[PDB]
Amino acid sequence: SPTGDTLAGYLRAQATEFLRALRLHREPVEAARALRRSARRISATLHTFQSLLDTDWCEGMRPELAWVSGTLAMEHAYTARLERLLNALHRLSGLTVGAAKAGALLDRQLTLARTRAHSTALQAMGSSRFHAIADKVAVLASEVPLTPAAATADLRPLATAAKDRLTDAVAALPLITAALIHGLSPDTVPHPQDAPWHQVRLLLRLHRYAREAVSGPVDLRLLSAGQALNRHRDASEAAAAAAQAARTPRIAPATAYALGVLHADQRHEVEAARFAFQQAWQK
């Protein structure tokens, strides 16, 4: 039955996966994903099981790890968003000049975003900030700073706590059985209900990785819930890219009209994703 030592084994294993990926990266796309997957697990573990670990160490590690996994996510997020949007436009045509223009506008904008993200990420990976946090992960592959009592402490109550945080958040979401035309400011909260759903997406991930830690170094219902929350997030962000593209100066009316449809489409996918999550969560 799982203890501090199980927790240490899980942390050492993830740390080692991070160092493997890092070595592969320094011979690339595969390695970066492996770096994300492991960074995110370590960061989660340091949250859920913080009480069994040195507090300062946790607090120093977590934002740095978050900085790493976020920096490494950006290129891919822009790449998948473009694809999602081009697919949706093709579908919504059933390209007329409007759709074709919107497609080319987003291809230009998101490609720039991607290329910018790609170079920023490679810069980050050569930086002294990155090296320092990677060095700590190297230490963690050998030594885990467990608190004195940790080695004998039962991990299950901590995992349960994470499960509770998830289930209480879900209980607080509205049932299902739109704001499709809105403007755009940094003061606008155009889609306010997105935030609780995106928080649940994170809590669900915390719970998944806690189950992993407890098992140490397949629930299909949770995987289905988790897929639905990724579509929620992706559709949400895609809709926002369409809206924002519609504010680009000098675009033709037909282009903005297409982008209006595309924003609406992706907001319809947000709602479907919320329904899918609900069916999966309630079985």
Minimum distance of its own copies from residue 248's CB (angstroms)? 8
Q: Do the Cβ atoms of 165 and 36 come closer than 8 Å?
A: no
Q: Which of residues 72-91 bind its own copies (CB under 8 A)?
A: 89
The answer to whether residue 243 forms part of the interface with Cl ion (CB under 5 A) is yes
Q: Do the Cβ atoms of 260 and 253 come closer than 8 Å?
A: no
Q: Which of residues 224-243 bind Cu ion (CB under 5 A)?
A: 243
The answer to whether residue 246 forms part of the interface with Cl ion (CB under 5 A) is no
Residue 255's nearest CA partner among 103, 78, 86 is 103
Binding partner at 222 among its own copies, Cl ion, Cu ion, none, C-beta below 5 to 8 Å by kind: none
C-alpha 131: how far from chain center: 23
- Return the residue of 88, 240, 246, 261 that touches Cl ion, per CB under 5 A: 240
The residues, any chain, with a CB within 8 Å of residue 210's CB and separated by 6 or more, are 44, 45, 48, 49, 158, 159, 162, 163
- Return the residue of 22, 213, 239, 258 that touches its own copies, per CB under 8 A: 258
Binding partner at 181 among Cu ion, Cl ion, its own copies, none, C-beta below 5 to 8 Å by kind: its own copies
Q: Which of residues 155-184 bind its own copies (CB under 8 A)?
A: 178-183
The answer to whether residue 253 forms part of the interface with its own copies (CB under 8 A) is yes
Q: Which of residues 250-279 bind Cu ion (CB under 5 A)?
A: 264
Q: Do the Cβ atoms of 47 and 213 come closer than 8 Å?
A: no
- What residue type is 164 in one-letter code? D
Binding partner at 93 among Cl ion, Cu ion, its own copies, none, C-beta below 5 to 8 Å by kind: its own copies
Residue 271's nearest CA partner among 235, 224, 222 is 235
The per-residue b/e assignment along 163-177, b for 16 or more CB within 10 angstroms, e otherwise, is bebbeebbeebeeee
Site size for Cl ion, by CB under 5 A?
Answer: 5
Q: Applying CB under 5 A, which part among 15-23, 25-33, 127-135, 243-251 lies near Cl ion?
A: 243-251
- Return the residue of 42, 46, 58, 261 that touches its own copies, per CB under 8 A: 261
The answer to whether residue 92 forms part of the interface with its own copies (CB under 8 A) is yes
C-alpha 84: how far from chain center: 16
Q: Which of residues 56-75 bind Cl ion (CB under 5 A)?
A: 67
* Angle, CA of 121, 126 and 128, to the nearest 5°: 115
Beta bridge partners of 3: 154
Q: Which residues bind Cu ion (CB under 5 A)?
A: 190, 243, 264
Q: Which residues bind its own copies (CB under 8 A)?
A: 89, 92-99, 178-183, 246-247, 251-261, 263-265
Binding site for Cu(2+): what residues are annotated? 182, 191, 263, 268
